[PDB]
């Protein structure tokens with residue numbers, strides 16, 4: 001299958017036609033996406049199979065073919081870009097200044113951008129083009145709008 | 157049966173559309189990976 005580094009759509013043919021259920025990142029031969037997109041199922045790339053290697057429901061992350069490789073972190077000061085890959089639409093960079101989720105275990109950056117659910121897994125990048133996390137696990141606030149955490153894994 | 161399709165390179169775009177606010181929210185994360193607002 002295709003193993004070139006980049007952003008990919010995650011599709012299924014189980015529902016009507018071909019439906020985009022999410023997005024992911026190929027980096028260093030490992031495919032990275034959010035757990036809720038695939039539920040840990042195996043994936044196809046052409047005639048090749050990608051098997052899950054690591055996953056965690058609470059972090060809402062999963063890696064295929066190898067361990068989680070993404071280790072860049074939001075600096076807490078600068079604007080970032082969401083590389084949004086919406087269903088049926090071209091990949092588009094959106095620049096924004098993250099807010100913050102404050103939790104009992106520490107603070108996390110958060111992005112207040114609204115997209116269809118099949119956009120989950122789209123990467124958030126810093127100014128060097130490094131992936132600082134994935135978009136698609138978050139909350140609905142007072143006005144009905146969406147705010148996603150910047151979810152990042154740990155590179156062992 | 158799920159499959160993947162390439163959609164692009166991962167690169168920063170100079171002069172991309174700039175939008176979105178920067179809210180500071182108190183949140184909780186449960187064992188099922190769901191975030192909730194704490195008030």
Ligand SMILES: Cc1cccc(O)c1NC(=O)c1ccncc1F
Pocket residue numbers: 113114115116117118119120135136137140144145146
């Ligand atoms: C629920 C979800 C999971 C993952 C990615 C998504 O991108 C969304 N939804 C929205 O952004 C969204 C837009 C507008 N109004 C509410 C919303 F939740």
